[PDB]
Amino acid sequence: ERPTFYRQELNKTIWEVPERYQNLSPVSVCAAFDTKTGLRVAVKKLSRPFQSIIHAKRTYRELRLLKHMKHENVIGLLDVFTPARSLEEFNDVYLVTHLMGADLNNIVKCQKLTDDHVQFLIYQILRGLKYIHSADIIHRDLKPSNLAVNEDCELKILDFGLARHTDDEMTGYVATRWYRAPEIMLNWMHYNQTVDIWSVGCIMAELLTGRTLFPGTDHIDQLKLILRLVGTPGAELLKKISSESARNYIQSLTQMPKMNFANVFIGANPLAVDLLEKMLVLDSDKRITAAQALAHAYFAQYHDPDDEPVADPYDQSFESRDLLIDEWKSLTYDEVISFVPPP
């Protein structure tokens, strides 16, 4: 039952993988050919997955998330393996997924798309988001670089459970921050699923115009760009900013009304403008949800309420648990050896 493994050094790291995977090429992630399925695959070798409690829990988190996702528009797990033959030997985890053709950041850089492509790409993101949000999974980091497409314009959402960004990585004129909802960028309040809809709005705007919507040079500049478009917060939203210091700062800004989005997105389909106004609402309680957006008339060409499935429940009670490294490692090992490949 255990396959035979073979070893290869690739950019100064030993990769040990079942024989079915051939033509490993660095892209740590390698592209490869799964001779058993005929699929072009991406293979991620986790770096030192059990070196600390925080790392061991992150390894378990990523594997739990990838094992759960079973949806056309979300990256799922084709395989997971370790060369270890016992829990005692277990120190390496490899994750195998479909290899997509390219990501939106690489394909659509500086380019506006036709309206039909914006409809189809945003439709597919929202279909995937309906699925993940129905499991109370929040992506939290949607941006063009973790949205991948194939040559048929079919899209998958990537990168779940990744290591939380450092302060330096979120600093300055950086795409790591341009798509974040203001309540998470400035820690206004406990955030929820609606943060992902803000990112979809920023992404949809950029597909329509070819331009970053809120290319802030830093957190404060970005907030000013945001509030110029959507207006400064009103009294109801201010009360929900539980961060007293954040609430006090935003009240120091001169009040500004929401702009006319038809004058910002000149020439765009009025249905696209309407949908953007319903996504890019400052108060997260009032943003359109993914399920609601799928029924918006902008997507009339694509919407099928019988083919927009929800997810099985996802138990993430482990998130609140404090365990030892070897306990996270044992949980991870159970998930590796119980993996069942998809059809």
Ligand X SMILES: Oc1cccc(-c2nnc(NCc3c(F)cccc3Cl)[nH]2)c1
Binding residues for ATP: 27-29, 44
Q: Which positions touch ligand X (CB under 6 A)?
A: 29, 42, 44, 66, 75, 95, 97-100, 102-103, 148, 158-159
Could you tell me which of 131, 69, 68 has the C-alpha nearest to residue 294? 131
Please say which residue, 62 or 277, places its beta carbon nearer to ligand X: 62
Beta strands of the chain (E only): which ranges? 5-9, 14-18, 21-26, 29-34, 39-45, 79-81, 94-98, 102-103, 147-149, 155-157
Please say which residue, 97 or 232, places its beta carbon nearer to ligand X: 97
Please say which residue, 96 or 273, places its beta carbon nearer to ligand X: 96
> CA 170 to CA 176: how far, in whole Å?
6
Please say which residue, 159 or 327, places its beta carbon nearer to ligand X: 159
The least distance separating ligand X from the CB of residue 337, rounded to whole angstroms, comes to: 18
Residue 159 annotated among the catalytic residues of the structure: yes
Tokens representing 248? 């006090």
Rg (CA), the chain: 21
Could you tell me which of 280, 272, 273 has the C-alpha nearest to residue 301? 272
Tokens representing 257? 């009304």
CB 62 within 8 A of CB 75: no
The least distance separating ligand X from the CB of residue 74, rounded to whole angstroms, comes to: 9
Catalytic pick from 115, 159, 274, 283?
A: 159
> CA 65 to CA 40: how far, in whole Å?
22
Q: Which residues are annotated as a binding site?
A: 27-29, 44
Local structure of 156: helix, strand or coil: strand
The least distance separating ligand X from the CB of residue 35, rounded to whole angstroms, comes to: 18
The least distance separating ligand X from the CB of residue 194, rounded to whole angstroms, comes to: 23
Backbone torsions φ then ψ of 339, nearest 5 degrees: -60, 135
Local structure of 141: helix, strand or coil: coil
Active site residues: 159
